[PDB]
């Protein structure tokens, strides 16, 4: 009786939700399925905004609105890296590319694929872009002041599961200008096979201390051999981990498209493969000579062919 009693449902709900998160000795569901200058500046603006009567009037008249672009730019500078890191880990980029190592993104990298001439499709984290839209190389811009920019097909390999294909890699990029990068790998369009799901493509940016000869990494131009596009980021960055530290991220998802047929035929010059999603066969207990109290259908579950046979006759 000493303890007070919850007066509303919400109080119990929130307490229960917190209770679940805390560890417990008994078995539970989770086990199995699992500076000061700024502050002074910040306060001044808030008092100014509070003083503004027009803001108060608009709020109580429920007509106010907020500029999206300004918030987006502010979010990127202040705490965008923290949110950006979450997405990469959720999509498995860290575990599959760096074997579990984590690097916080810092440069608000920007990419967009030019569509025709009037418009250009942006490439955020987790966006969906068709292979046709990615036929040509995109426009890349970032605030710097060397660099290496890299492309991967994380899950598009057709023979070896671990390996991945390069689209193009520029090295020895000075400052922001990108035309000065060495074209180690010429650009190729995405080619995800039909019926094989969603593939994730990643944009990587590494800070370069001093220019390094990537002669071994360089691929011939033009190169249409898949045996040469295969590589591993983990070992690749191991040989350059002294002068290379990642600083950028951007990825998108793409499905099959008609252009993919052209890529496999015209330049890859091979027959395109087709994949289908197959479910495991249904489970049936072992067959019995006498199926007591089972319907006539019992015999159908164990037959292979649907057409009659006549044996010796």
């Amino acid at each position: 009786e000493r303890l007070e009693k919850y007066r509303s449902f919400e109080r119990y709900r929130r307490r229960a939700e917190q209770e679940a998160r805390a560890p417990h000795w008994w078995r539970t569901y989770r086990e199995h399925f699992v500076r000061t200058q700024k502050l002074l500046e910040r306060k001044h603006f808030l008092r100014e905004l509070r003083a503004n009567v027009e803001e108060e009037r608009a709020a109580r008249l429920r007509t106010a609105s907020i500029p999206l672009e300004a918030v987006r730019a502010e979010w990127e500078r202040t705490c965008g890296p923290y949110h950006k890191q979450r997405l990469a880990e959720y999509y498995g980029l860290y575990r599959d590319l760096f074997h579990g190592a984590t690097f916080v993104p810092w440069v608000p990298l920007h990419v967009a694929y030019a569509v025709g001439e009037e418009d250009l499709i942006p490439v955020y984290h987790g966006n969906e872009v068709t292979p046709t839209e990615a036929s040509r190389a995109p426009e890349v811009t970032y605030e710097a002041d060397l660099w290496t920019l890299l492309f991967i097909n994380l899950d598009g390999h057709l023979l070896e599961p671990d390996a991945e294909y390069v689209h193009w890699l520029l090295t020895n990029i000075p400052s922001n200008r990108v035309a000065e990068g060495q074209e180690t790998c010429p650009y190729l369009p995405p080619f995800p096979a039909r019926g094989s799901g969603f593939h994730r493509f990643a944009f990587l940016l590494f800070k370069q201390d001093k220019p390094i000869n990537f002669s071994e990494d360089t691929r011939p131009s033009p190169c249409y051999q898949l045996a040469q596009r295969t590589f591993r980021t983990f070992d690749f960055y191991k040989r350059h981990q002294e002068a290379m530290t990642p600083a950028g991220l951007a990825f998108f998802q793409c499905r099959w498209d008609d252009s993919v047929t052209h890529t496999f035929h015209q330049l890859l010059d091979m027959r395109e493969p087709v994949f289908e999603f197959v479910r495991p066969p249904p489970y049936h207990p072992k067959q019995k000579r006498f199926p007591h109290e089972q319907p006539l259908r019992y015999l159908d579950r164990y037959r292979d062919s649907h057409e009659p046979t006549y044996g010796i006759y």
């Binding site: 449902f9 919400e10 989770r30 399925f33 699992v34 910040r42 603006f45 808030l46 905004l49 509070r50 803001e55 108060e56 608009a58 709020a59 429920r62 007509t63 609105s65 907020i66 500029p67 999206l68 300004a70 918030v71 987006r72 502010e74 979010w75 202040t78 705490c79 949110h83 979450r86 997405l87 959720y90 999509y91 498995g92 599959d96 955020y124 984290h125 987790g126 966006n127 969906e128 994380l154 899950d155 057709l158 023979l159 599961p161 096979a193 094989s196 799901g197 969603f198 593939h199 249409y224 051999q225 898949l226 045996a227 998802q253 890859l268 010059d269 091979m270 493969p273 994949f275 999603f277």
Partner: protein, 141 residues
């Protein structure tokens, strides 16, 4: 032809390949408890004494998309932390983040009294107009 060598079985490792296809399992039990856990992605809206928040969380429990008045950029342009317009705005902020993240389908579980609340109705209007769907599609067996 070297290029024509292909393994019999493809192995996509995308953590969201099956979920987007619609062929991934959703937990179907919890018939004596509220709320139902048969969702790929769920939206939780929390109202505190001084702040209002909203999260998108996967079944395992990891938050993927989050918007909160605690975020600095939001408040500096925000007159009041607890307003009907603020609920609309935080929803609009969340909506844009979801679309770029690619989370086009979601589910919401408003309690009866909370559902009647005008602010929540306004928030739903913000999400639906932005095009985030508040009911997931049925699984394909």
């Amino acid at each position: 032809k070297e290029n024509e060598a292909v393994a019999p079985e493809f192995t996509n490792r995308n953590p969201r390949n099956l979920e987007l296809l619609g062929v991934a399992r959703k937990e179907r039990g919890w018939a004596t408890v509220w709320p139902n856990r048969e969702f790929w992605h769920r939206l939780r809206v929390v109202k505190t004494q001084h702040h209002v928040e909203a999260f998108v969380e996967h079944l395992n429990g990891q938050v993927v998309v989050s918007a909160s008045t605690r975020e600095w950029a939001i408040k500096k342009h925000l007159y009041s932390t607890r307003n009907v317009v603020a609920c609309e705005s935080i929803g609009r902020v969340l909506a844009q983040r979801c679309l770029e993240a690619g989370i086009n389908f979601m589910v919401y579980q408003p309690t009866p009294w909370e559902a009647s609340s005008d602010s929540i109705k306004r928030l739903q209007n913000a999400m639906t107009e932005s095009g985030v769907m508040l009911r997931e599609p049925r699984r394909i067996y």
